[PDB]
Curated annotation (Swiss-Prot), chain A:
Protein task: Binds to the 23S rRNA.
Family, as annotated: Belongs to the eukaryotic ribosomal protein eL24 family.
Gene Ontology MF term list: rRNA binding; structural constituent of ribosome; zinc ion binding
Pfam families in the cross-refs: Ribosomal_L24e
UniProt GO cellular component terms: ribonucleoprotein complex; ribosome
Taxonomic source organism: Thermococcus kodakarensis (strain ATCC BAA-918 / JCM 12380 / KOD1)
PROSITE patterns per the UniProt record, alphabetical: RIBOSOMAL_L24E
Domain of life of the organism encoding this protein: Archaea
Record-given protein name: Large ribosomal subunit protein eL24
Keywords recorded for this protein, A-Z: Metal-binding, Ribonucleoprotein, Ribosomal protein, RNA-binding, rRNA-binding, Zinc, Zinc-finger
HAMAP family: Ribosomal_eL24 (MF_00773)
Cofactor note: Binds 1 zinc ion per subunit.
GO annotation, biological process: translation
Binding sites annotated in the UniProt record for Zn(2+): C6, C9, C32, C36
UniProtKB/Swiss-Prot annotation, chain B:
Self-association and partners: Part of the 50S ribosomal subunit. Forms a cluster with proteins L14 and L24e.
Protein name: Large ribosomal subunit protein uL3
Gene that produces this protein: rpl3
InterPro entries in the record: L3_arc_euk, Ribosomal_L3_dom_3_arc_sf, Ribosomal_uL3, Ribosomal_uL3_arc, Ribosomal_uL3_CS, Transl_B-barrel_sf
Family annotation (Pfam families): Ribosomal_L3 (PF00297)
Lineage: Archaea, Methanobacteriati, Methanobacteriota, Thermococci, Thermococcales
Keywords: Ribonucleoprotein, Ribosomal protein, RNA-binding, rRNA-binding
PROSITE patterns: RIBOSOMAL_L3
Native source species: Thermococcus kodakarensis (strain ATCC BAA-918 / JCM 12380 / KOD1)
Family: Belongs to the universal ribosomal protein uL3 family.
Curated annotation (Swiss-Prot), chain C:
Family membership noted in the UniProt record: Belongs to the universal ribosomal protein uL14 family.
HAMAP family: Ribosomal_uL14 (MF_01367)
InterPro entries: Ribosomal_uL14 (IPR000218), Ribosomal_uL14_arc (IPR019971), Ribosomal_uL14_sf (IPR036853)
Name listed for the protein in its UniProt record: Large ribosomal subunit protein uL14
GO cellular component: cytosolic large ribosomal subunit
Gene Ontology biological process terms from the UniProt entry: translation
Family matches, as SUPFAM superfamilies: Ribosomal protein L14 (SSF50193)
Keywords: Ribonucleoprotein, Ribosomal protein, RNA-binding, rRNA-binding
Assembly and binders: Part of the 50S ribosomal subunit. Forms a cluster with proteins L3 and L24e, part of which may contact the 16S rRNA in 2 intersubunit bridges.
Species per Swiss-Prot/TrEMBL record: Thermococcus kodakarensis (strain ATCC BAA-918 / JCM 12380 / KOD1)
UniProt cross-references to SMART domains, sorted A to Z: Ribosomal_L14
Single GO molecular function: large ribosomal subunit rRNA binding
Amino acid sequence: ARWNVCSYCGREFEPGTGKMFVRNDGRVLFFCSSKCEKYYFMGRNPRKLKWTKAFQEARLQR
Amino acid sequence: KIHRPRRGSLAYSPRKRAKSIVPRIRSWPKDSEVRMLGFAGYKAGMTHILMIDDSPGLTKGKEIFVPVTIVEVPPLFVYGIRAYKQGYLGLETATEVWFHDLHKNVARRIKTLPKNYNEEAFQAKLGQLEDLVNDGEIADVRLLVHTQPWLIGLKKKPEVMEYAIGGDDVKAKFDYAKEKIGKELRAGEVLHEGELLDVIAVTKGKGTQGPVKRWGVKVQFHKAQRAGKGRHIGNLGPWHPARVMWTVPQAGQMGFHHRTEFNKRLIAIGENGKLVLDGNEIEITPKGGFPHYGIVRSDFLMIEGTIPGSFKRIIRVRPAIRPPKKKPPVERPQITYVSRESKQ
Amino acid sequence: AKKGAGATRGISPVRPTRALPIGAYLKVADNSGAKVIQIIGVVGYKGTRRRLAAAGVGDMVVATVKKGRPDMRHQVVRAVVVRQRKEYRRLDGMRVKFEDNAAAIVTPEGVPRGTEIRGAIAREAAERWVRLGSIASIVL
RNA sequence: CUGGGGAUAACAGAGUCGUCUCGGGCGAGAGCCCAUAUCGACCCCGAGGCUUGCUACCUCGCUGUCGGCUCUUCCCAUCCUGGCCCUGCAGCAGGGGCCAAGGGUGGGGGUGUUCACCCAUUAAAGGGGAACGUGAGCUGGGUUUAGACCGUCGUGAGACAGGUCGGAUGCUAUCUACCGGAGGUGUUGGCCGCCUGAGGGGAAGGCUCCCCCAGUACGAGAGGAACAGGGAGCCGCGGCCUCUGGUCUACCGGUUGUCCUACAGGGCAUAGCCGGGCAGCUACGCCGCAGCCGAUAAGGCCUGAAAGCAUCUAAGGCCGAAGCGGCCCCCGAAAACAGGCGGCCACCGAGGGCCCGGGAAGAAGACCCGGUUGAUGGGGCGGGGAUGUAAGCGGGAAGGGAAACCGACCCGUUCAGUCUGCCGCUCCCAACAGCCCGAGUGCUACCGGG
RNA sequence: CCUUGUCGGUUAAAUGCCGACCUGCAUGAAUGGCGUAACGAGGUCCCCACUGUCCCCGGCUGGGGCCCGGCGAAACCUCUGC
RNA sequence: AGCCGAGGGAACUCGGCAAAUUGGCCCCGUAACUUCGGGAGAAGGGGUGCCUGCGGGUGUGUAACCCGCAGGUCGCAGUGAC
RNA sequence: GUUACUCCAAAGGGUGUCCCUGGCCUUAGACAGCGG
Ligand SMILES: [Zn+2]
């Protein structure tokens, strides 16, 4: 029972939950929720959302 | 001709509201061990675990996802003993003895209780029954029991039930009962982890429903959907017999039915809302509380799978009457993860 | 064992969801002349009144070739479904999905026609059909 | 067009069975030879009324419709599934027969089609009956009413058991019937609760593949089994919301046009449109569904006469099916022998109902929980969640400007603000006050003790 | 008429559509014959896109249906009604 | 009487009935066939918001109407509804 | 079977049982066993 990490929001999600999206070239993505999946594919940028970790990292980048 | 099977089953007819909301048990299993053959509690919620598969099949030895329902089981109070003899057609009640010291709140259910009935009269009646049992006139002995829902702040009105006892010797059963009367019973003293159980409850209510939902009939062609007969059936029958058959599907009550569900595994018995792993104790109540319920505080069963009924409802449990040959072993399985995250 | 030396068929524990009914088009992922097929049947399937046969990853289907080199056009072939868009569950509870719906053309006995598969395939298919996992680079 | 007609056709029914379908007797013979493993001529005897005809008993304003969709039930004259027998039965298979109707018998292409033909799967993709089941259930493609075209026939008006295009589908359920929900009476006083379980219903289960047995028996080879034992799925049935998806006119945010003077905050335009979305409902998600015990069918045997031997049968016994009965599940004291038990009252009054705060129940009724000996609804304080960082203030901003300054937008304050048909704690407000129904009598025949 | 004529193309599969063949039951030249750009709520076959038409049905919104107060008819009707 | 619907995309049906898709303006580009008039908006492809500044036409005009360019910036989406 | 009629299935088979007859055998016949 190990905890996977989300490719959009960077938080950990519990065993028996979420999704693995597989590209044909082999790159694997993990999603905690439909929210994150849908935002990632319609193109919202997580570096501007204060409920993600990429925001903290980009603030460090300011 | 095109052949196909009929729409729904005829084995649960008439499809009516249950007589009572407390479920009765019609048949009992054969168990050599002299014990009380079941228990009762209140449904609380669902979650899931991850565990190493113990059942026969492939996936044995593998980690697997398993869903779980939690039943809160405070201790029952054994308030009486009842004797049964053989009648002309079947069993007939001979005599009951009630205990003398009862909780106040039992009068909310049994409005007319005895008044004086001292300890001494109690012992005299038990002696009468012991002599009756020693004579040879008696075919069966059963316990009379009631719930205590004031220890969990759910209610004050109790549920009153009658349970059976395992084994063959009527005298041995009676000795068990004489030990148990006037004392509390806890689920650990009756059930074994890893056992298969049957579960009995009244199903969720849905009211009046039509035949698409009640019997699984087809929706009609889109022309009929625009003609006003989309969710109807076509016809009530042939010219002769010149009457509607009872077998033809129609609308009515759906849900609030009596149902029994076979072979659900008990996976763990807990204590004061906590479960013991290898080293640590963990609260099974999830963050924020079980929805449409609150916080589990007394004692609980984990039963894998799904069970009938709404959340705050009375559930009865017995040992399996119709189990398979290839059983899982009667020990608690090795659990690796229990979900405590919010369920809302 | 009668003949265990070289076997074509295997055993998976998962059983994905039947997601692709009769009439579905499938992109061909191997290096045979075919490019697009259409499902006309699902091998080993019995239904009921007005229900269509449907297949998921790991299942053998009967198909017709729609686009492809002229020797293969209008032929009825067997194929194994190797990639699908609809989610299905693993033993741990996690759902997996892919980006397209894709099949690989085989013989009734199970032997692949072709030498390589282009892209990722599913572990369920590689397990049910053992000779595909050798001609596929990436397996999940 | 009028008046009439079942005195008289079309159609469903009724009758009959030449014809039809399904059988049988004998045996011409065919089968290396051998009547009957298989096939059986010519003559002769029948069953059925689902094929067409014959007749004219019923019906001329009952309904006149074919086909398809939907839904229920019945038969066996058995395609598959269970069990057996013979063979021109080595094995794998075939052919022909007996028991058996519990379950299954599907998806598509052209045509209005039933039927028939074809394709890919399949254990097999059986057929019939119920007003050629089913239009007060749907459809209306076909069935030449009124319009129109072609061919042919006819002086012509016109016609065609010829083709082609188009062409109105009404109904507030009186009685019974069924599905479900309630109120009474009775059960020889009334009330509370727990049980028994007569009788009724059930397919609650049915089927396929894979591994192993085993490259074995069998067999010249090539090919190629079975009992037991292990796994997975398809169809059917019953439930549940942890996980995954859909909806979520609760909620949060973005943005267009216009009105409230701009700001802030709002109204209207399908919730204006777009994105997300908990609870709840739901499947495209998940959980569960025994094989044993008895008696039988075809069939296989024992003992054993009639008929000193022999013989499965005449009297008697043992075995033996997915079929019958039981176990198991659902309804069930109006089960007219209208039940059993414990307790309360009675011979003012036990007990019930309305009213009140509610919901896990619900078309009205009914069900369930609570009512100050109280956390039932609300408020307040906290928790868990949904969305996505408010207003104000400050600091910047591509560029413009003599300059004070303008500026869509960016950063900070700020996981913020707004919300919560979920949980907890706390008597702060309200569960106050009441109003109705309610069993009392004996005669004779008694019963067991007074 | 035999008729789903025969051959070819279109489909996994064609009583359809298109093109050819000619024993035209019963075509044919102002009861006009053969063609034809543009036009058609005309009839008919195919391809791209799209979709709850269907696999297989689910959840929402308003109005009715249901309960309450008021106004208040009709068609139909031998008697009845397992 | 209306809104949404995962994966498939006419397998539905006599028949794609009904529903969906497309949609305004500017630039590019446009087949067969033809009565040379058309077909033709054939088909097919790119772009479109806000703010800051520069320029043109007519005009006496920092009056009024119309036509182009460059840069910055936000959003899943700029004929954002109609 | 328990049907006077209105309103009831054969050709062909069985000696299943109860009866009437006619020929050949029978002081050892039809087999049942030891043998030629
Ligand atoms: Zn995430």
